[PDB]
Amino acid sequence: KKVWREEKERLLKMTLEERRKEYLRDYIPLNSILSWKEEMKSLTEKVSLYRGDITLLEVDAIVNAANASLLGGGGVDGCIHRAAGPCLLAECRNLNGCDTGHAKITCGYDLPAKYVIHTVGPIARGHINGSHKEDLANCYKSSLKLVKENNIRSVAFPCISTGIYGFPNEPAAVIALNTIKEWLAKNHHEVDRIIFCVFLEVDFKIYKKKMNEFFS
Template structure:
């Protein structure tokens, strides 16, 4: 993996004039940080097959090192045997589909090393994901509206598909009734899109609660209500995972799911 990562950094450096003569770090962690930053910044342009092969080898090795968690092995919770609550890294979850909280361009986060879920998913899925999203957006011809969903392959992630949805951006921190409905629409659209793609398991992130400032408790209540309502009417999804990253979100979902 070390050699493949070095070749990947060297190639990505040649794509940007400002990085001409870029030195490849010796430290493996520094080398990966640089590779990720260069991948985050690059536009959706094709790369040679040999470069993709090196990238894929690097990403799959990192997934193997981190270990994958199978959504089917997670204990279900409370009154519905189809819902699970899990605190972990969604990029390591083996499910039929995982949800990405995307922006309206659907091309991922271009800020090097940013800690949003959009950046993480694009980073560990690989260059192919931005290319696939670009194809979708070019065919569509306009920015992705809030409350809908689109599916792409997951490429180097343990999941099979990624369901991309754009949640409401609550700049004031206080959602309107219309924004509540937009968030609810995100959850319904993700479930319908995943089910239509033949998925039987779907893992949700906390849509809109990060950079888009939707209050956590209110967002979680909408998420749980929409999931339960959908499951009451449709049997195609056999496992919904609410994936949270920190203890506060875990406690919120744990309480709501017990109610």
């Protein structure tokens, strides 16, 4: 049995070259993801769209749209737990859950990602209200506060609270893009790339349309 504190200490010391020599499977290096600037040929240099499996991204942090327990479950949360291996669950158990609109950081273990930022999106069981909208913004703000504090230069976000948590995809994207744009205005020097992970066609088309509005 690997023990999470020992494995985390070992992994966070390692250079990218050292990490790559131990990788279990194929990965997506950050320099194989075009900026919006490069894609559409300024903050356009600092943002990307990625349609693919977040667990493959070799970035400083991937964001997990987690549940209150932080123990994993289904969808992409489950995929991140399986890809990271059992040390992720062990570190998450020690965190004693996460509140709606808050975030907590762990090691990424078997992920190529150095860290996972776990954030708990609001749940809309029917039509959204101002609390849902505030809480979703707070997931992005709490996550980006951990990005700043942990010298994370590349981070990938999922479409937090869309799907089962019931946040309509278009209003979710507006909150996500507004929150990242406002944070980038202040913090652009300290990041190389914020990646929006937009697998479903519905999300890809929403983000494709809105990128120019927000970043150029």
